[PDB]
Paper text:
Phage satellite P4 polarity suppression protein, Psu, a building block of the viral capsid, inhibits hexameric transcription termination factor, ρ, by presently unknown mechanisms. Our cryogenic electron microscopy structures of ρ-Psu complexes show that Psu dimers clamp two inactive, open ρ rings and promote their expansion to higher-oligomeric states. ATPase, nucleotide binding and nucleic acid binding studies revealed that Psu hinders ρ ring closure and traps nucleotides in their binding pockets on ρ.
Irrespective of the bound nucleotide, all assemblies contain two open ρ rings, denominated ρ(A) and ρ(B), that are laterally bridged by multiple Psu dimers, with the ρ CTDs facing inwards and the ρ NTDs facing outwards. In complex II, two hexameric ρ rings are bridged by five Psu dimers that connect ρ(A) subunit 6 with ρ(B) subunit 2, ρ(A) subunit 5 with ρ(B) subunit 3, etc. Complex IIexpanded is a complex II constellation, in which both ρ rings are augmented to the octamer level by incorporation of two additional peripheral ρ subunits, providing binding sites for two additional Psu dimers. We further refined complex II (ATP; global resolution 3.8 Å), complex IIexpanded (ATP; global resolution 3.6 Å), complex III (ATPγS; global resolution 3.65 Å), and complex IIIexpanded (ATPγS; global resolution 4.25 Å). The incorporation of additional ρ subunits supported by additional, bridging Psu dimers in complexes IIexpanded and IIIexpanded is facilitated by a further increase in the inter-subunit and ρ1-ρ6 rise values (10.5/11.1 Å and 52.4/55.5 Å, respectively); thus, the helical pitch in complexes IIexpanded and IIIexpanded is large enough to allow expansion by additional ρ protomers, as they can stack on preceding subunits in the stretched ρ rings. While clearly defined in low-pass-filtered maps (6 Å resolution), density for these peripheral subunits is weak and fragmented in the cryoEM reconstructions refined to full resolution, suggesting that they are more flexibly connected or bound sub-stoichiometrically. We nevertheless retained these peripheral subunits in the final models. Irrespectively, a long natural rut site RNA would have to access the SBS via the lateral opening in the ρ rings. This lateral opening is physically obstructed in some of the observed ρ-Psu complexes (ρ-ATP/ATPγS-Psu complexes IIexpanded and IIIexpanded). ATP or ATPγS are bound similarly between all neighboring ρ CTDs in the ρ-ATP/ATPγS-Psu or ρP167L-ATPγS-Psu assemblies.
Numbering used by the authors:
A (entry chain h), B (entry chain g): 4 to 190
The structure:
């Protein structure tokens, strides 16, 4: 059920990110409408600037969380598909890559990890040969639906909103401002 | 036919290493027998010591060449078995690994490498799992006899005799010594 929980967590993260962008855009458009108005309302303009910038920070945080969740679910799907395919064809890969992986026993696990490296370079060569052959690759039909829903990569809007970085001090003052925003809107 | 060529190269290299080591053993035995005798043979002792040194250098070079040939033939066997198994199960590999390798041909070199590293380390955890549960490993059916002949690892007499790390100047002066010794034994 790990795949299902990863998938629906990614789904609700996507929904939350869309909602964050929705009221960010709404706040921006009504703020520029207020700017176009004849009313001075200097305090109104300042606190709208505060609202829109904290909403931008919240949108960035939501986009980062969604990107992390998408990466996590993609990694989990890769792990499960590689694992059950590996169980399906363990003997084939074993026979193919044995001359360095034979006789694992224990060997202090220090000669064996460098042997694993000396086998994974060969696996990298295998993938290079496959990819130079250049056939068409499709998703695994066992769990292709969830991967198609989440897509190959996060949307361009997410990465565009996650370009800039924030210092820890900025992060915690932003969290405090978000908490005060929630407190004031609750009342 | 490259695998057979590598196998016969390894065979003749190890035969040359064996003949070098037995010649060195005979030379050292003759030197110690002469030393045990009462004959002065000061110049004879010096030239026998020179023969011992050049035979030791030749044994080291032969052991290094045999180790290199064994590594080369093992790598060739890895490549051949890998190619056969991968032509067998390319579709299965693609289905298992797809969620992280789509559209590589249009990706730039940076994206190329970043995708290759993720493929390699995903295969890394896959191999760690296989090696963790760890069943009994055997040779590939097609090339079992060659692996039996060459062995999983080179003999300890090869590895312990290649730990001198002679400098290049030592290498070429010893080559000159071997050349002049061959010239004078021919006469």
């Amino acid at each position: 059920t790990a795949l299902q929980q990863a998938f629906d967590t990614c789904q609700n993260n996507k929904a939350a990110w869309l909602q964050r962008k929705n009221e960010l855009a709404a706040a921006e458009q009504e703020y520029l409408r207020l700017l176009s108005g004849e009313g001075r309302n200097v305090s109104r303009l300042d606190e709208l600037r505060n609202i829109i910038e904290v909403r931008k920070w919240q949108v960035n945080q939501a986009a980062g969380r969604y990107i992390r969740s998408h990466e996590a679910v993609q990694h989990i799907s890769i792990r499960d598909r590689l694992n059950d395919f590996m169980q399906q064809h363990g003997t084939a890969l074993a026979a193919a890559l044995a001359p360095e992986l034979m006789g694992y026993s224990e060997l202090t696990a220090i000669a064996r990890n460098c042997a694993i490296q000396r086998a994974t370079d060969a696996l990298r060569e295998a993938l290079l040969s496959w990819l130079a052959k250049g056939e068409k690759i499709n998703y695994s039909a066992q769990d292709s639906d969830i991967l198609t829903t989440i897509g190959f990569r996060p949307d361009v809007a997410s990465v565009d909103d996650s370009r800039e970085k924030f210092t820890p001090a900025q992060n915690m003052i932003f969290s405090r401002k978000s908490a005060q925003l929630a407190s004031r809107q609750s009342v």
